[PDB]
Every structure is written in C-alpha cells, then in structure tokens.
Write a protein that binds this ligand. Structure first.
Ligand SMILES: [Mg+2]
Ligand SMILES: [Zn+2]
Lengths: 49, 97, 146, 1105, 98, 49, 49
RNA sequence: UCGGCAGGAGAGGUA
DNA sequence: GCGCATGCTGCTCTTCAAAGCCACGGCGACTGCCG
DNA sequence: CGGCAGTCGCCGTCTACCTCTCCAAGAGCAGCATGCGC
C-alpha cells in the first residue's frame, strides 16, 4: 500500500526525443529484472538482448 | 537565500582594490601542510588564520573551546572561533613585487 | 576593428588599467583539497603547485630587489615570475606546458571551466540524483500500457 | 589424430592436408628466446642462414660500447651478458605478491690510454623479469601479457596527388628513419623541386645538391634528361658549397651567426653521422631494395649516404615524367611506382623482444650519459668500473615498462579460449602508433594483402573496430617483422608437396590458386579454369595453365576462435563476428560436455592453451587421487603431478583440474592426464546440448527473449561457481599500533560467535550482507581509547568461507614497511540460472531469459519428452545466419543415430561420403570443418535414415519437423515444428551483478552531489539530453526538484527527509552549491562577477544569518 | 552533396561545393563554347549592362528549366531566362539568392 | 566501386573462401561508418537545440 | 553571457563580456536551469502558477 | 558523550 | 678493557633541458614578400 | 607603397553503465654503533 498509485519514471539512453522518458505504475514481481510492455519498445527503441 | 529575488548577473574587470577587498589576508610562505603533525602550517596556502578553523568552535591553541566563545579572536593564535564551513568561502591574496 | 575595443572602455565607467596585475587572488582551500593516498602520502593537487611556484618566485624576487642586485639578474627574475603567473592562469597558451611527475601537464585555473569535462557541461547542466536505480529489462506480456 | 589418446570424432572433410598447424604460442616465446640469447634460438639460427648469431641484449651492449670522453684518455666497454637462477618459483611469487625474475650480470673493462693498464670486473645490473612456459609475465603477483604492435616500417615512401586549383599531378617523397630527422622532397605547382630539411620552411633542392659537393656542371650533366631540374638549376643563385652551407645554416639554426665551419658540421652531424641518425636494419634493407642499390653484400651501417639521396631525386623526377624503369650508375633494375602505406609489405610487427629492447636501450643511454659526465670529475688511479656505473635508470625503465604501460595488459582468464586469444593479438595503438581519434576510415579496412596473415572477421565492435586483430593459424613472423604464410609449389599443372613461405611483397608477382579446387589422384586440376588471385588482389577466372602456387588449406585465412564455428560459410560476416566475440565470454560450469557437432580445432586449442595436464614421458600410472597422480617411468624415475583445486582466476571464476586416468593405465608421452576448467576429455567444451523448438510462444520470446525449462534448474545443467577475495591491513599509527583481536568493546556478543581466538572467521561459516569477517580495533592514545574498524562483507554479498591466508611480520615474512599483519579471506557461491541472464550460441544468437516454465507447461513430443528451450522464428531470416538451422538438423541426426542402406549399392547422394560415415550409433560425435564440411544433399539424405526410439516410432520426419502437443491446453499444434539439438553457452553478464538502487548515501566533497558507481553506493546521472525531454514535456516542477533538493541543496535535503518521515508537505527548494563554486571559480580569475537585486545592492550570497 | 553533409551545409549556412550562378536580371543569354570553361554574360532585356557571369568550368553541366518554349531547354545562346534561373547544375548559394 | 566478378552462390549453398573474403570489404565499411555517423549527428542536434 | 559561455568558446566569450561589462537578466531556459529556478514554459509560467 | 570518510592516469568490455 | 673515529640506512627536500617526438575541416588574421 | 597569397594557429568532433592496476627520485645528512689500538 506504500507503492499503490505512486508513479515512477523509466529512462533509456540515448534520449533522442520526448518518449525516452515515460511514467508507469509499479507492480511487485519476483526476480531481479524489470518487466516492460511490448508496445513501448518502439518509443524506447529497446530490444531484449 | 531566495532565488525569487535575483534580477541581474553583472561581470567586469577587477582592480587591485577589489582583490584586496575580497581577501582576508596575504599568504607569504609556500608551505602547504605539516606532514608529521598533520596540521596546517602558518601563513602557508592552508592556514587557519587567513581561511578558518579546521574544526567547529576551535582554534590553533586550546584557550577557547566549545560553542560559547564565538565572536572572540584568539589573541595568541589569531584564529576566529566559529564554524569550519567558512573555509569554502574565504579567500586570500599574494602581493607581487 | 579597433573601434570595437576602444569604445567599450569609453561607453562604460571602467578603466583599461585592469589588464596589469598587482595582486593575485587565492581560491579557498576546500576547493583544492589534499588527501591521503591510501595510508601513504599526498600526491599532488594540480593547483597547489602553481601557487607554490608563484610564491617562491615572488619571495626570491623580493629578497633580490631588497639587496642591490644588478639589473640583468632582476630582469631575469621578473621574466621568470611573469612566466610563472602566466602558466598559473593558462598553462600551455604560450611556449610549452609545465609538466609534473610522468611528463603529465598540470591543469590550470581556466581548464576547470572549458571543455565537455568542465564545470558548465558536467556539474551545472547535468547532475547525479538520489532515489534512482538500474537493472536489466525483460519482456512482460501480461501487463497493461500503464 | 596425431595425439596419443583422443576421442574418435569422425569427419565430413573431403580434402587432405599436407601441413600441420604450428605451435600456437610460438609468436611470444620465439621473440623472448631471441632476446635472452638461449641455446635453443642459437641452434635454430644455425639450422639456416648461420651468419651472425647475435642476441637481443648483446647487440645493444655492443652498439653502446665504447664510451669515450672529450679528451680521449680512458674508455669503458661491456660484453658477455649472463643470467643467474630464478629466485623463487611461480607459485611462491603468485602467493607472496612477488615478481618472477632472475639476476643479470655483465662484464665491464676500463682502459686508460695514458698509461695502458686494464681493469675488468663483473658488475650486477638488476633483476630481469622472465617469461613462464605459457607466454605470460608475473609482475607484482599479477599475470600480464605483452601485446604485439603493428607499425610502419622505416624507409623511402613515394606518393602522388592532384591539385584542385590548377589541374596536374604533384609528387613527393618521405625518407622516414627509425630515429632521426625527416627529409622530404616534393615537386610543386610550377616546377620548383624543393626540400624541407627537418620541417624547416622550404628551399630548392639545388642548394642541398651544391652543399653536398655537386657543381652546376655535374648536376646539369646528370639531371639533364628532365627539364624541371634544368629549371631549378637556372634559378638557385647559390653556386658554391660554402655559400650553400651558409644558406641552409641560416635556415636550420635561426638567429645564430652562420660560420662555414658550423654549417659544415651541421651538414654532417644530422644525416651522415652515427649518433643521431639511424636507419635500422629494416630501413637499410628496404632502402637497398626500392632504389636498386648494393644488395650484393651483408647489411652493415645505418646512416644515410649520398648515392641514396641522389637516387631518390632521380626516382622522383622519373616518376614525375611517367616512365616505368630506372637504373642508377652501376645498380640493377626496378619499377618506378608509388607505394601504399597499409600494404602488409610496408607494415611490420614489433613483438615483445623488440618492445623490451627499446626500454633497455633508453635506460642504457641514460646510464651512459651519467658515466660520461662523471668520468671527468673524479681523480685518476682510483677509477674502477664499479664506481662509474649507476643501475637506477635501467631498473626504473624496466619497472616503468612492465607496470604503467599501454602494451603490457592485464590478462583475461574467463576461460582458456580467451587466454589463448589474448596472446595472439595484433594491436595498432600504443607508444609509437596511432590514436583512437586520429585514426580515420582507411586504416580500419580489410586490405587484400591480409589473406593468410590477419583475420578479417574477429575484431572489436565498439570504437576499436579495425584497430585490433588476430593472427592466423598458419602465419609466422620474419626475422625482420614481416608476416609470412605457406604455399604449395605447382609445376606443369601438377601440384607438388613442397612448402614455401612467402611475404606479401613476394606473392604479388605470382598467380596463386584457391584452396577449394578439384584435384585428381595424380594432382591435375579437373576444372578447365580456376579462380585465382592476381597482382593487386584482382580476382579472375584464368584457364588453369598459368598457376604457380596454391593454398594449403581452406582455413588458412581464419583465426583460432573463428575456426570453431560449424557451417561458417552459411553465416553473414556480422553474425560470425558476434559469434567469435561471444565465444570468449563463456563461463566454466560445474560439469562439462563436448559438442555433438564440432569442427576438430577444439582438441589442439586446449593442449596449446595450457589449462590441461599432459605427460612429459611414457609410463604406467601408480597412484591416482583427487589432487595428485604418480607416474612410474620405464627407466625407474617417478614423477608426481599436483592439481589446482578451486582456484580463483583473474575474473572471479573457478579453475579446477580433475584426473581422467585409472590406477593401472599405460600412458604415452603427450597424452592428456588431467582435465581443466572448460575441458571434456581433452577437448574444449564451453556449453551444453539442449533440445530446441523454433516457434513463437505467447509472446514470452518476443524481440530476442528466450524461454527456458525448469529441468535446467532442478538438475544443475547451467550452474557456475564464483569466488571472491577480501583483504585488510594492520599497520602502525601516530597514536599507537592497530591490532587484530576478537575483543571489541563496541559491539555485542551475539554477533561475535563465528570468530576464532584470533579475530578471523572460521572456515565453513555462512556469511551474509553486513556480516563480520575480521575484528580490528585502533587505539586513540593513552583506557577507553579503542575505536572500531572491522572488515565486513559488502552490500549484497554472501557465500561460504573456503580459505584464510594470514601474513605476519614477526614470523620472518616480507611485508610492506609500516604494516604489521595481513589477512585474506575467500568467499565462494554457487549461481544457478534465472531471469535476466544472457545466453548465446556459436552463430550470433543472443538474448536474455524471459521466462522459466514448469516441465508440465512445455511443448512435448509424441512420447512425452518436453523441450528445453524455445527460440523465435522472426529473427532468423532477416539476419542471414542460417547455420543454426543446419546445426540443429545435424545435431538431431547425430543424437538419434542413423544407418544408410546399401542393399542395391551406395545411393547416388552418398557417393562422396567416407565408408565410416555410412552408419552411426546413438549419441555420436561428428566434425564438420570450417570451409569443407557436410553438404546439403548429405544432410537431406541423412534426415531420412535416422534410427527409431524404444518403440518403433520416428518422431522427426524427412524435413526435420515434428508434431508437438500443447502442455497448457492438451490439443496438438496444427502444424509441424522444427526440432533438434543446439549448443548453448552461458555468458558472463548476469543480472545479480547489475541491480542497484539508492535513496541516500555518501556525497562528494567539492560539489556536494551524490557519488558515482555501484561499489561506492552512487546515484544515476541525469544528463543534458534528459533535461531537454523534461523541458519539452512542460514539467517545470519535476526538473526543479530533480536539480535542487535531490542533488545539491544541502539545507533542503534534510528538511525533505524530515517532512517525508513525519508525513508533512515537502518544503521549497533553496539554491544549489555548484553555482557558488562556479562564482568563486570566476572570482579567482580576476573577474568581478556579482549578483544584483532589483535596485542594485549586491546580495551577499553566503548565508550565515 | 547528400546526407548529413548537405543538411549541415543548409543549416550552418556556408558556401556549397559546386556553386551554380543564378540570373541577376531577366534577359536573353550569350552562351559561348570555350575550351575548358564557358563564359556567359546574358543579354539585358531591361536596357543596361550585361552581368558578366563567366569563367564557369566545363565539368559542371547545364540545366533544364521550364523555358518559355515549353521543354527542358539546355542554355542555348539566345534563351529568355528569368530572374532566378539556375544557369548551371549544382547547389546554389543562399547568400546570392537573398 | 563494384567488382566485375560476381558472387554466384547463395547463403543457402555456402560461399567459397574467396567469395567470403571479398564479401567482407563492404561489410566492415558499414560498421565503421555506422560508428562514425553517430558522433556527427549528435553535435548537429546539440547545435540545433 | 551565461547561455553563450556554456555552449562553446568559454574563454573568448568571458573575455568579451568582461571587457564590455555585460549584464545578464536571467530570462531563459538554460539560465533558469543553471541558477535553480522554474523555467518559463509549461507549468512554470505566471498564468498557471 | 568521546569518536568518525570518498583525487588523477591507463587498459579491456555491454547497449 | 676503554676510548675515539668512521661509516649505517631512514628521512627530507627541491625541481629548465634536451632528447623525444613525429587527423581534418573551417576561418581569420597577418606577414613577409614580390612587384 | 601596395596588393597579396600562402601560412599558421586555434576552435570543434554521441550518451549511460561495468571490471582491473599504478601514483618522484636522488642525494645529502643525520644520531648512533661497531671495530681497532695501546
Ligand atoms: Mg539491443
Ligand atoms: Zn588559540
């Protein structure tokens, strides 16, 4: 309930335009990696390798 | 300080009078720091008299200590009894021959 | 070409007598720190040596002037003091740079303001911040757009 | 083959090989053998061309001596270098943090010409670091590798340019020496030949020709065939050698008064000398090769003569004319052409010996200057060689080279392949080469002369692309520094079996055929026309009757890591580049297994790397345990070999050796006795064999992600061991002396239960983050003067404790001055596979693990066998790496086993297969060489011959596709899917070493911003490009908060923290400190910068109120 | 030029590589063929002095405008070019066109 | 400039030694220029901002 | 001079400003970022603040 | 209540 | 056996020599140099 | 005197992250310490 409805900002370098920074709503997962939506990879220009 | 009160930023050439104004004292000896006592030298480039006390409310000698002696200049050392954060904002000068 | 310089000293209320120095300021000590090298000694500060050179030349010049020295020696000392101050303000602009241990040129007062690794483009236009993290990203197909 | 005990790996190769690959580490050891002057190199040089067996140190010591003074009364000389025995073995030096070296002695004699007496005695000239048997140095306890350097060769270099102002060609020269001054003739826009003697302005070449002693008559008589020389002749106006000497004197020495005697000596002590000009052996050989000079006698001397310069000028005018021949008075014949500066006949190699010899020479010259200066201030009759010699410069130069240098690099020990590759690297940078910024786009290209000398595929991917390369497998280095490569001589259209090594400057005058050429039983070409390589790398289709040479093998042009990719010719260059780079990043696993599909290079890449144990003689095994093997020789001698159990490498990995012999086996010399880190029965094994399916699956393998099974975690298939090391030091202080003890009056007794009676942890204890390792206290002066300073486990670390090494001063151990005790603690952990870890293949496949699934959620074959990994099909066609699909097909065929029917004779598609490849057993190992392997008709025919399983069913049909069931719904998938086996490696990019977070922590000193880095608990930079996005969004408050109260506002940070904890509102930001630092910086340059208000009255901007 | 080179020679406004002259004053042309360099000077259809636009090289070709005749005419001595016509073929100069 | 001799074999049949060698001449240039056209576009962007 | 000194040629612009005795009014995006104030765009303008 | 710290250079990598 | 004389290695202090060394494009002042 | 053209010197060349090692030297000058001689 601390992290409920508290947005965070995700950023990937280089930041070539506005959509290199976006605000999401965090969820607790199991592991040590961040999970990213498939539809924002075009704006972030981010593959998964 | 309030950032909402600035209105200008002026630059210009500085004269010798301004340089002697900003300064709190003149350095004479090229020494920097005592290697063995690990304490600043006198009239060097790292000096408590010109720049400020290394520790809070202290001085070179031990006549005045703790926070009750502020405003008093030590008469045998010459170090002000004040905070140690004043060493980031006090300058000095060199008198060229 | 000349009027651009000759009129600046007239339109304002300054004087052209600021290009010749008679006192040199000294930066506060906490801006040029000297720290121990892993329980050994102190190894340079890149700004406390150019000051030591200036002070040494000034002291020698004062002692030689207040002795009755011939003109040639005093002129040599004055030239050497001028070169030392010039190297303090901008090292390498005239002649060859003043090097230290390992033939590594020393860094002057004007080298902490210029370039992509200076104050302007590395401490004022971009900083390091608290409340931040980093990790490797992976794909999650069960999430929503927010 | 050719190795006593090796696994039987059948091969698909159709060509035979007349040569065997050489020693893979002889480029490092041969140079040091030459430098040291050992008998092995002496015998090798006596085998061929035994003229001057001169060592590396001897030639320096003989070029130095004799050292004479100005008067000419006494002299000093040196001779006879010799080495003592190495002080300590390798393991002692690696343990006690020492250096592996042996003392060096030379003999010096002192002659006095005034009297005639001679006094000679042996002097000691310091310890010389020595190279181990693997080609590495141990310097201060760390293993190091010296990397070879690619540098231009001294000599004469012509050119050709066109001008955009006018329209005509302009030529030039450039006499580049090893050490000296640069000459530079050149034609001009009009017609005035000029010379820039030492980059000093310009002057017509006729002043120099006159200075040297050529009168107008002689010149005009010799240089009269051309007209540009006539023109220059009738416009010098300096006729006279003395006035020409003065001419160049008032040019090279400005301000000084010109005296004919000084000009005479300046035209001799610059080029025609022996002390300042030196065209080294290479330079001399190349000059007397281009300018067709005296190539009839040995190569002696190293200074510029007159004939040389005259021939240079002649060549330049004949080249400006446009001929193609020339002959100097009494010479030979040579073409008149310009040369390229990137040709591998103009670039030489500076190996380790010539890199150490330069530093030794520099130290020698400094010592020589010192002794010359000190020989004239001492009194005679008390002068001895031991009193004139100073050792400090030489040892200083040696220790400066072997330490802070750009070419003696920290060795990488991720796995044996990376270590082997590090020692075979050719680097174009360093003290004397290029720069990452100055280098353009023409020095980073694949020249046609690299064929057989450099690998065109293995190169870095970042800013060092094309500046670092690898030597080829068959390449070798000249005694001058030029790389050679072997060829087979052909005569009358028949290929012989005589091997000749050719340099790039000799193979451009011959027609060289191609490795993949049909050759009959006798040796005659089958095809009427063959693909050859002509002079300027021109590929042509000539009729086979002109060929003069032939390649030795199809893998002549690839390195040792590129020759380990099966089906390389089916892959694009970029993907093979990535595959070769990523084969050196694999980590060793707890259990190793060799590939099902290989290449055959993996057996000799493990013996030559040196991470295995081989037998030095023949005998029977007497005793075998987990840490020693005892072998009894035939003569009677017994030898025992020890093992390294759980040793830490340079990169934190584990280096473990295990025996693979029994207690009664017979062992032949050269047989592998023990395994190694990434070795399986003598051959290199960097990964595991896994069952693959090529299909999309619910979007979990979207955009290069990978889906794994849970059987890879429950069975420890991909698990590795990582070891860590921590130290602390006990020293003295001005208030006392630090002591390590369990008694600490600051912390409780509950957390001091895992410590022994000495303050150290006990072996076998499980430590965690923030736990205690050793307990140390510091006195503050004399009680109650004890402070706490204890070594603790850093943040986010854990693992068992496996070893402690304590060094003390009182027990007679070498220690740095000022410290009393040392202690090291080793901590080890076992890491499994998880989300975020990076996997790879040999063909360029690369991605992180997206999901790990239960074995019941996985697609399974008709008999109930789940698959182990799922890969997406959208990434294969657009990247042109189709070798992976062929690898999966061949791997399935090898795993299942096959049998070809020959009831009605051998089928037509199996005509060229060997007789041992017509039948195979389950779990067989095959080999497909890099450019001569399995064709596609053979694969298509083998895919329909595979054996069935326990029940008489064939799961994979003739296309390599199988019908799978869905493990979540139960229904079969509507179309067949490709199944097979593939080789998967684990890369050293793990997510447990990349996660980081911070709320508050340590801050800086000058600008009170958060620290940087993960080891120092630092923050993340919010750079300039990230501010533009904030300003384009319109977020004025987020940026202000990010820039003031989270970075620099010292007074607002604490109030913000208090407000957050107490639940109140966040306060208003103040002013950053970096602005004040900038203002004091501007004020220290005598600039009067002030901050005004709305009505003047400058603000103080210092707080304090 | 093409690519970033060009983008920056149209942003950081500088003189191009092959500068093609433009017609100063609407008029007929005086296209004469020389050895390695043409030399036009144009005809003043206004009543003044011909703008001597000569010394152009041969390498750079001639252009094809939408001439009054109604086709891709290559500058022929006696051609009614208008104010702004790029005589030759090559990026013009942004300071002369101003 | 184009080489007058072509590469007659697809990647499905496998190139020979010489075809594979001459395929890399214009495969290295791509990467080097890609690496050198990322440092002259970011200075143009910084100048435009 | 504050916005031009942080772009290029710091020494030349500083010398010219010192000779001319120039004054900065701190009315831009870069200067307001440097000194630590609200930028005059988006939510930092008077109507919305 | 004593008591209490964080600069440069070089090399190799990932996106 | 005692008294004289001469050399241990840590510590301190101060800074020119001198050989060693070998992108690219744009711009603007400037300076000998020819005419 | 007056054009002038070559020349030289000074500006600029993408962002974020990870791991490792190395950091003046020489010469003089102490306050004692150990050998030899009568
Ligand atoms: Mg990527
Ligand atoms: Zn006091």
């Amino acid at each position: 309930e601390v992290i409920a409805e508290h947005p965070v900002l995700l950023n990937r370098a280089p930041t070539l335009h506005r959509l290199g920074i976006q605000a999401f709503e965090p969820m607790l997962v199991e592991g040590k990696a961040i999970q990213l939506h498939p539809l924002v990879c075009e704006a972030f220009n981010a593959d998964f390798d | 300080l309030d950032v909402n009160f600035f209105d200008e930023l002026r630059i210009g050439l500085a004269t010798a009078e301004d340089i002697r104004q900003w300064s709190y004292g003149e350095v004479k000896k090229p020494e920097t720091i005592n290697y063995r006592t690990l304490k600043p030298e006198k009239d060097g480039l790292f000096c408590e008299k010109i720049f400020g006390p290394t520790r809070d409310w202290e001085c070179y000698c031990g006549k005045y200590k703790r926070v009750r002696f502020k405003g008093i200049i030590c008469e045998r050392c010459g170090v002000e009894v004040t905070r140690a954060k004043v060493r980031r904002e006090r300058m000095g000068h060199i008198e060229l021959a | 070409k000349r009027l651009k310089v000759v009129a600046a000293f007239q339109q304002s209320g300054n004087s052209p007598m600021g290009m010749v120095l008679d006192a040199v300021p000294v930066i506060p000590p906490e801006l040029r720190p000297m720290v121990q090298l892993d329980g050994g000694r102190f190894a340079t500060s890149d700004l406390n040596d150019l000051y030591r050179r200036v002070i040494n030349r000034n002291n020698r010049l004062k002692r030689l002037i207040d002795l009755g020295a011939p003109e040639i020696i005093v002129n040599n000392e004055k030239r050497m003091l001028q070169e030392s101050v010039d190297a303090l303000f901008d090292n390498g602009r005239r002649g060859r740079p003043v090097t230290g241990p390992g033939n590594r040129p020393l860094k002057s007062l004007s080298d902490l303001l210029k370039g992509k690794q200076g104050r302007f483009r590395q401490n004022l236009l971009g900083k390091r911040v608290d409340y931040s993290g980093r990790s490797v990203i992976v794909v999650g197909p069960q999430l929503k757009l927010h | 083959n050719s190795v006593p005990g090796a696994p039987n790996r059948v091969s698909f190769a159709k060509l035979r090989e007349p040569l065997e690959v050489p020693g893979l580490l002889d480029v490092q050891t041969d140079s040091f053998e030459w430098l040291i002057g050992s008998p092995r190199w002496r015998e090798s040089a006596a085998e061929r061309g035994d003229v001057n067996p001169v060592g590396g140190l001897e030639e320096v010591l003989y070029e130095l001596s004799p050292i004479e003074d100005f008067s000419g009364s006494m002299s000093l000389s040196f001779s006879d270098p010799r080495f003592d025995d190495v002080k300590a073995p390798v393991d002692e030096c690696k343990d006690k943090d020492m250096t592996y070296a042996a003392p060096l002695f030379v003999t010096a004699e002192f002659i006095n010409n005034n009297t005639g007496e001679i006094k000679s005695q042996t002097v000691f000239m310091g310890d010389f670091p020595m190279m181990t048997e693997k080609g590495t140095f141990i310097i201060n306890g760390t293993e190091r590798v010296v990397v070879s350097q690619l540098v231009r060769s001294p000599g004469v270099y012509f050119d050709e340019t066109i001008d955009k102002s006018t329209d005509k060609t302009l030529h030039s020269v450039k006499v580049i020496p090893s050490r000296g001054a640069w000459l530079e003739f050149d034609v001009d826009k009009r017609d005035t030949v000029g010379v820039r003697i030492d980059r000093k302005r310009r002057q017509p070449v006729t002043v120099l020709l006159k200075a040297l002693g050529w009168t107008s008559e002689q010149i005009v008589e010799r240089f009269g065939f051309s007209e540009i020389m006539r023109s220059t002749l009738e416009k010098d106006n300096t006729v006279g050698t003395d006035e020409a000497l003065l001419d160049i004197y008032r040019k090279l020495r400005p301000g000084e008064p010109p005296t004919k005697e000084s000009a005479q000596t300046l035209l001799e002590n610059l080029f025609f000398k022996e002390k300042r000009y030196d065209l080294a052996r290479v330079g001399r050989y190349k000059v007397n090769k281009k300018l067709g000079l005296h190539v009839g006698e040995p190569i002696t001397s190293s200074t510029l003569t007159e004939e040389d310069v005259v021939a240079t000028i002649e060549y330049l005018v004949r080249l400006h004319e446009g001929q193609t021949t020339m002959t100097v008075p009494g010479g030979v014949e040579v073409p008149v052409e310009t040369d390229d500066i990137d040709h591998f006949g103009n670039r030489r190699l500076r190996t380790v010996g010539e890199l150490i010899q330069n530093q030794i020479r520099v130290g020698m010259s400094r010592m020589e200057r010192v002794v010359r200066e000190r020989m004239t201030t001492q009194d005679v009759e008390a002068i001895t060689p031991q009193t004139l010699i100073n050792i400090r410069p030489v040892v200083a130069a040696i220790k400066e080279f072997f330490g802070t240098s750009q070419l003696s690099q920290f060795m990488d020990q991720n796995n044996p392949l990376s270590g082997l590759t590090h020692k075979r690297r050719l680097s174009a940078l360093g003290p004397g080469g290029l720069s990452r910024e100055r280098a353009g786009l023409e020095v980073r290209d694949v020249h046609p002369s690299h064929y057989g000398r450099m690998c065109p595929i293995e190169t870095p991917e970042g800013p060092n692309i094309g500046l670092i390369g690898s030597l080829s497998v068959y390449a070798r280095v000249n005694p001058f520094g030029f790389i050679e490569t072997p060829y087979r001589k052909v005569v009358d259209g028949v290929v012989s079996d005589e091997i000749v090594y050719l340099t790039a400057d000799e193979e451009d005058r011959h027609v060289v055929a191609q490795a993949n050429s049909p050759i009959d039983a006798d040796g005659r070409f089958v095809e009427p026309r063959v693909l050859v390589r002509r002079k300027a790398g021109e590929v042509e289709y000539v009729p086979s009757s002109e060929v003069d040479y032939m390649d030795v093998s199809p893998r002549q042009m690839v390195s040792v890591a590129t020759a380990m990719i099966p089906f390389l010719e089916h892959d694009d260059a970029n993907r093979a580049l990535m595959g070769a780079n990523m084969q050196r990043q694999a980590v060793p696993l707890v259990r190793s297994e060799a590939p099902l599909v290989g290449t055959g290079m993996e057996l000799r890449a493990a013996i030559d790397a040196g991470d295995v144990v081989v037998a030095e003689e023949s005998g029977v095994i007497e005793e075998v345990s987990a840490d020693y093997i005892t072998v009894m020789h035939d003569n009677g001698t017994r030898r025992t070999y020890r093992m390294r159990k759980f040793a830490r490498s340079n990169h934190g990995t584990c280096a473990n050796q295990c025996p693979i012999v029994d207690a009664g086996d017979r062992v032949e010399a050269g047989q592998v006795i023990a395994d190694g880190p990434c070795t399986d029965d003598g051959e290199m094994a960097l990964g595991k064999n896994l069952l693959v399916a090529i299909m999309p699956w619910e979007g979990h393998n979207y955009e290069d992600a990978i889906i794994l099974s849970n059987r890879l975690v429950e069975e420890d298939v991909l698990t590795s061991i990582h070891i860590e090391e921590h130290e602390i030091d006990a020293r003295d202080t001005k208030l006392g002396a630090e002591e390590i003890t369990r008694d600490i009056p600051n912390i409780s007794d509950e957390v001091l239960a895992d410590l022994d009676e000495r303050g150290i942890v006990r072996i076998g204890a499980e430590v965690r983050d923030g736990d205690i390792l050793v307990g140390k206290v510091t006195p503050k002066g004399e009680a109650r003067e004890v402070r706490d300073t204890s070594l603790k486990v850093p943040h986010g670390e854990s693992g068992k404790v496996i070893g402690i090494r304590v060094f003390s001063r009182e027990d007679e151990d070498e220690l740095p001055a000022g410290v009393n005790e040392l202690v090291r603690v080793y901590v080890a952990q076992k890491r499994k596979i998880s989300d975020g870890d990076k996997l790879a293949g040999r063909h360029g496949n690369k991605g992180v693990i997206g999901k790990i699934l239960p074995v019941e959620d996985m697609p399974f074959l008709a008999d109930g066998t789940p698959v182990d990994i799922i890969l997406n099909t959208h990434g294969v066609p657009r990247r042109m790496n189709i070798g992976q699909i062929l690898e999966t097909h061949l791997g399935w065929c090898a795993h299942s086993g096959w049998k070809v029917d020959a009831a009605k004779g051998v089928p037509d598609w199996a005509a060229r297969l060997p007789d041992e490849l017509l039948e195979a057993q389950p779990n067989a190992i095959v080999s497909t060489p890099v450019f001569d392997g399995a064709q596609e008709a053979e694969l298509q025919g083998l895919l329909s011959c595979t054996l069935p399983n326990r029940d008489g069913d064939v799961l994979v049909d003739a296309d390599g596709k199988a019908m799978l069931f869905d493990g979540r719904s139960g229904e079969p998938f509507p179309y067949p899917v490709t199944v097979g086996y593939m080789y998967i490696m684990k890369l050293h990019h793990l997510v447990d070493d990349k996660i980081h977070a911070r709320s508050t922590g340590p801050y800086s000193m000058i600008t009170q911003q958060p620290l940087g880095g993960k080891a120092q608990f630092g923050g993340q930079r919010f750079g300039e490009m990230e501010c533009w996005a904030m300003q384009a969004y319109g977020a004025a408050y987020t940026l202000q908060e990010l820039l003031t109260i989270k970075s620099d506002d010292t007074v607002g940070r604490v109030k913000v923290y208090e407000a957050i904890v107490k639940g109140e509102n966040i306060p208003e930001p103040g002013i950053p400190e970096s602005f004040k630092v900038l203002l004091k910086e501007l004020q220290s340059l005598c600039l009067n910068v002030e901050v005004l208000s709305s009505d003047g009255a400058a603000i103080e901007l210092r707080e304090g109120e | 030029t093409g690519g970033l080179p060009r983008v920056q020679e149209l942003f950081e406004a500088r003189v191009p590589r092959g500068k093609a002259p433009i017609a100063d004053v609407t008029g007929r042309v005086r296209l004469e063929d020389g050895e390695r360099f043409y030399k036009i000077t144009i005809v003043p259809d206004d009543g003044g002095e011909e703008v001597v636009y000569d010394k152009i090289s041969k390498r750079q070709r001639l252009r094809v405008f939408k001439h009054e005749d109604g086709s891709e005419r290559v500058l022929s001595d006696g051609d009614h070019v208008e104010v702004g016509q790029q005589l030759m073929e090559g990026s013009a100069d942004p300071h002369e066109v101003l | 400039e184009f080489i007058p001799r072509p590469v007659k074999s697809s990647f499905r049949e496998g190139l020979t030694v010489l075809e594979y060698f001459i395929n890399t001449h214009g495969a290295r240039k791509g990467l080097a220029d890609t690496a050198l056209r990322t440092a002259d576009s970011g200075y143009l962007t910084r100048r435009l901002v | 001079w504050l916005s031009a000194a942080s772009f290029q040629e710091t020494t030349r612009v500083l010398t010219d400003a010192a000779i001319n005795c120039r004054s900065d009014k701190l009315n831009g995006l870069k200067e307001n970022v440097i000194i630590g104030k609200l930028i005059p765009a988006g939510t930092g303008i008077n109507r919305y603040r």
